[PDB]
Structures are given as structure tokens and as C-alpha cells.
Design a protein around this ligand. Sequence first.
Ligand SMILES: O=C(O)[C@H]1C[C@@H](O)[C@@H](O)[C@@H]([C@H](O)CO)O1
Ligand SMILES: O=C(O)[C@H]1C[C@@H](O)[C@@H](O)[C@@H]([C@H](O)CO)O1
Lengths: 58, 58
Amino acid sequence: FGNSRADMEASGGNSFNGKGGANASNTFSGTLTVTVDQVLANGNLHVVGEKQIAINQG
Amino acid sequence: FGNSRADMEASGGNSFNGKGGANASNTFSGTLTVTVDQVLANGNLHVVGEKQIAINQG
Ligand SMILES: O=C(O)[C@H]1C[C@@H](O)[C@@H](O)[C@@H]([C@H](O)CO)O1
Ligand SMILES: O=C(O)[C@H]1C[C@@H](O)[C@@H](O)[C@@H]([C@H](O)CO)O1
């Protein structure tokens, strides 16, 4: 060890960060009167309805 | 490792952000007297009505 033959110095680093996300929301707060389309074998009713409103410009 | 042969340094990044939205609202707070148009087989009434108001300039 007379010289710096044994003198040693070293550093090392490794950092990793990963992220991920997702969202999906929906809301509906109306009331619509529909009409029966047909009666199924079990008695369930197929209902279809439509409502058109022309407030102004569309 | 005498020289910088092993000396290493690196960085990397990847960021992504996506968004989306939509809204649709409507309101109606009137009163209109309508007239029956015809009587359906089940007794339902087809009602049609119209009201015209000329406040001024239109
Ligand atoms: O004993 C040896 O072998 C050495 C001692 C140091 O001086 C070393 O560095 C080398 C030099 O390169 C000679 O020129 O010689
Ligand atoms: O032992 C070798 O092969 C080396 C030592 C370094 O000096 C290196 O860089 C290369 C240089 O390119 C020679 O000119 O030679």
C-alpha cells in the first residue's frame, strides 16, 4: 500500500419509478316516458322511447 | 476501470396524461294547454298543442 495502489473509491446508483392511473365516471339524471315495443316469452317488456326538445338554435 | 471505461451515467423519462369530458343539460319550466289529436286502441290520447306569443318585435 505504499502508493495509492490499494486506494479505492467508487459510487453507484440506480433509481426507477413508474406510475399509472385511469378513471371513468358518468352520470344521468333525467326522466323519460317510453313505450312497450314487444312482450317477451317470460313476460319481460321491450321498451323504446324518444323525446325531442328544441329550446332554440338546435 | 483505470480510465472512465466503466464510468456510466444515464437518465430516462416518459410521462403521458390524457383527459376527456362531456356534459349535457336542459331545463323547461312552462305550462301549455294541448288538444287531443286521436284516441289510440289502448285508450292513450295523442295530444298536440301550440301557443304563439308576440311580446314585441318578434
Ligand atoms: O518496484 C517496482 O516495480 C516499481 C516501483 C514504482 O516506482 C512503480 O511505479 C514502478 C515504476 O513504474 C518504475 O518505473 O517501479
Ligand atoms: O492498452 C491499450 O490498449 C491502451 C491503453 C489506453 O491508452 C487506450 O486508450 C489505448 C490507446 O488508444 C492507445 O493509443 O491503448
